Amino acid sequence: EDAMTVLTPLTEKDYEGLKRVLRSLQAHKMAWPFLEPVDPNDAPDYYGVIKEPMDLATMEERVQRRYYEKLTEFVADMTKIFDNCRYYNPSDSPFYQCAEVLESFFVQKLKGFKASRSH
């Protein structure tokens, strides 16, 4: 990551942009597996094998409460969503495919956000 992403404290203005990014992901058709925490009754051994679960509702709470100090930390939580999903699910699963699609969408939005921050 670039130095602004790593070092620049997130401001209130930055948080408006973070909320916009999160809302765009929540609204995406392929976000359905990531909207809320993984249900243990749907996913055998999940919480036994996934050390740091994450989901979009948890990130929404963190954005509201100003949890993140640096953009890198917001990106790290988001990246957990996708990495956890690819870790636990087979590559031919619809879940895995959702992670591939939504991650690409997130990267597009994130670049947009970083650009906007820079001007």
Query: Long-range contact list for 1-9, CB < 8 A, 24+ apart?
Result: 1/72, 1/75, 2/114, 4/71, 4/114, 4/117, 4/118, 5/70, 5/71, 5/72, 5/75, 5/114, 6/70, 6/71, 6/72, 7/70, 8/70, 8/71, 8/117, 9/69, 9/70
Domains of the chain: 1-119 (1.20.920.10)
**Does residue 44 sit in helix, strand or coil?**
coil
Solving technique for this entry? X-ray
Neighbours of 118 (CB within 10 A): 9
DSSP 52-65: S---HHHHHHHHHT
